[PDB]
Design a protein around this ligand. Structure first.
Ligand SMILES: *[C@@H]1O[C@H](CO)[C@@H](O[C@@H]2O[C@H](CO)[C@@H](O[C@@H]3O[C@H](CO[C@H]4O[C@H](CO[C@H]5O[C@H](CO)[C@@H](O)[C@H](O)[C@@H]5O)[C@@H](O)[C@H](O[C@H]5O[C@H](CO)[C@@H](O)[C@H](O)[C@@H]5O)[C@@H]4O)[C@@H](O)[C@H](O[C@H]4O[C@H](CO)[C@@H](O)[C@H](O)[C@@H]4O)[C@@H]3O)[C@H](O)[C@H]2NC(C)=O)[C@H](O)[C@H]1NC(C)=O
Ligand SMILES: *[C@@H]1O[C@H](CO)[C@@H](O[C@@H]2O[C@H](CO)[C@@H](O[C@@H]3O[C@H](CO[C@H]4O[C@H](CO)[C@@H](O)[C@H](O)[C@@H]4O)[C@@H](O)[C@H](O[C@H]4O[C@H](CO)[C@@H](O)[C@H](O)[C@@H]4O)[C@@H]3O)[C@H](O)[C@H]2NC(C)=O)[C@H](O)[C@H]1NC(C)=O
Ligand code: HEM
Ligand SMILES: CCCCCCCCCCCCCC
Ligand SMILES: [Mg+2]
Length: 335
């Protein structure tokens, strides 16, 4: 049993704006067994049928869906998708849950690997999210109205009632402070440190209608529609160019910050980690993740070994471009 995993799709042929909330991709409510998780992007694509509506998909489906639905840039899609798949997907069946555990991903892999989906805390998903609560408080996937209220507040205080790059700079810092003060297990290093800055500009670059060319800013009605209800705005047109994390540099600049966490199970006790990846040391992220994959798969032998080798190579093709050159690692050798 098992699947032979194809290489990732390339960029879409057509890269302009278009109506994505169309007749063939209607919003529909969740059925029994349907899965949703911490990503509002993937959630919206599933609830409109760009992904399978049950929220379980192949890497290739996820990549084509983020491109068709949102014009997410090809390399960015590769980096995110195979990261999620290596850590949280089933490499043998080639299926990833965008939320929690489900029989739909197929017969479970050998522990410590889990294939328990994007909900799994610790190596990918982490703390100081915009509309999701830290895992320490008991739920890392659900929309949180109190946190959305803070999104609205900061938009009112810094963005004239809209979400824009200024708001993102301020909100990111403030959420870090919230977690320092209230979460003794707060971690903000490695994958999370990098992903946390990119996530704060995705709403600007990808959730703002593509026909808006100037003074791009997101309304709270549209924010609520996507973040809470998993629904495209009416007549939503995607970005007119492939995009991802443009502006993330500026968000960090507004309140410079260093990877680390609360030490010794205590609040207000943030200690820097000088070994973590950061924005001038991106290849460390690659090495760390390959490390984590070795911990999940200490001695694979069969179809599982084959599919690990392929998925690792696929990921590297994206990482190499995105991080400006990394030496490929071969922890399971060549095919
Ligand atoms: C996200 O969204 C938010 C919200 O919309 C958005 O915020 C806007 O940000 C821009 C900046 O990018 C703001 O525009 C700038 O505002 C600067 C501050 O203006 C104040 O001070 C001015 C300077 O006063 C001089 O003169 C007085 C004498 O009167 C003197 O005492 C002072 O010492 C000083 O020397 C002042 O003119 C201005 O007041 C005018 O405007 C207000 C309306 O806002 C009006 O009520 C007043 O009566 C008066 O007409 C104000 O109090 C300002 O310095 C800056 O100007 C520079 O650029 C212009 C060119 O655009 C040049 O002409 C000039 O030489 C300056 O170099 C500019 O106007 C804007 O106001 C924000 N809007 C809000 C609501 O906050 C973010 O940008 C968004 N983020 C992203 C990434 O898009
Ligand atoms: C949606 O998301 C929000 C935000 O994450 C959740 O609300 C948080 O819930 C946690 C857990 O109950 C709260 O944590 C506690 O906060 C105390 C500080 O509170 C004051 O200061 C903050 C920050 O300025 C204010 O927002 C707040 O109103 C108070 O004025 C801490 O002192 C507590 O620490 C104690 O427990 C920890 C853990 O055991 C120990 O390590 C400490 O030493 C100490 O004994 C604690 O951390 C947090 O304040 C809440 N925030 C907000 C904004 O309400 C919601 O629960 C969530 N909703 C759902 C349904 O999930
Ligand atoms: C390409 C595959 C994708 C994967 C695997 C993925 C995965 C994730 C994960 C795991 C999180 C949670 C992060 C955390 O708490 O640390 C997340 C959050 C997020 N994703 Fe995605 N994502 C993908 C694509 C997209 C796309 C295309 C968009 C935008 C259109 C998007 C927008 C977001 C936003 C805004 C958040 C933050 C939600 C919040 O903090 O409240 N993602 N994603
Ligand atoms: C947050 C939703 C998508 C996940 C982002 C994962 C990307 C990891 C690194 C991105 C590259 C940053 C510098 C080019
Ligand atoms: Mg989170």
């Amino acid at each position: 049993q098992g699947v032979d995993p194809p290489p990732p799709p390339g960029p879409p042929s057509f890269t302009g704006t278009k109506l994505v909330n169309d007749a063939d991709h209607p919003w529909q409510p969740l059925r029994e067994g349907d899965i949703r998780g911490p990503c509002p992007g993937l959630n919206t694509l599933a609830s409109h049928g760009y992904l399978p509506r049950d929220g379980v998909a192949t890497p290739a489906q996820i990549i084509t869906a983020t491109q068709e639905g949102f014009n997410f840039e090809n390399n960015a899609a590769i980096v995110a998708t195979y990261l999620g798949h290596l850590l949280n997907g089933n490499l043998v069946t080639d299926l990833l849950s965008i939320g929690g555990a489900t029989p739909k991903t197929g017969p479970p892999p050998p522990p410590p690997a889990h294939a328990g989906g994007l909900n799994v805390h610790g190596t990918f998903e982490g703390d100081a999210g915009m509309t999701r609560a830290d895992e320490f408080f008991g739920d890392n996937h659900s929309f949180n109205q109190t946190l959305f209220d803070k999104f609205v507040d900061f938009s009112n205080r810094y963005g004239g009632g809209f979400y824009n790059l200024t708001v993102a700079g301020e909100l990111r810092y403030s959420r870090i402070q919230d977690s320092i003060a209230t979460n003794p297990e707060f971690q903000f290093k490695n994958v999370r440190f990098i992903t946390a800055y990119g996530e704060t500009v995705f709403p600007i670059n990808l959730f703002v209608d593509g026909r808006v060319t100037t003074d791009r800013k997101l309304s709270m009605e549209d924010a609520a529609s996507i973040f809470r209800d998993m629904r495209f705005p009416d007549d939503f047109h995607r970005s007119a160019v492939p995009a991802s994390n443009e502006g993330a540099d500026q968000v960090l600049a507004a309140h410079p910050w260093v990877p680390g966490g609360n030490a010794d199970n205590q609040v207000n006790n943030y200690v820097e980690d000088p070994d973590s990846a950061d924005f001038t040391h991106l290849c460390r992220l690659y090495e760390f993740v390959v490390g984590s994959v070795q911990e999940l798969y200490p001695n694979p032998t069969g179809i599982l070994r084959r599919n690990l080798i392929k998925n690792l190579h696929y990921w590297w093709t994206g990482v190499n471009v995105a991080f400006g050159g990394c030496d490929e690692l071969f922890p399971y050798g060549q095919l």
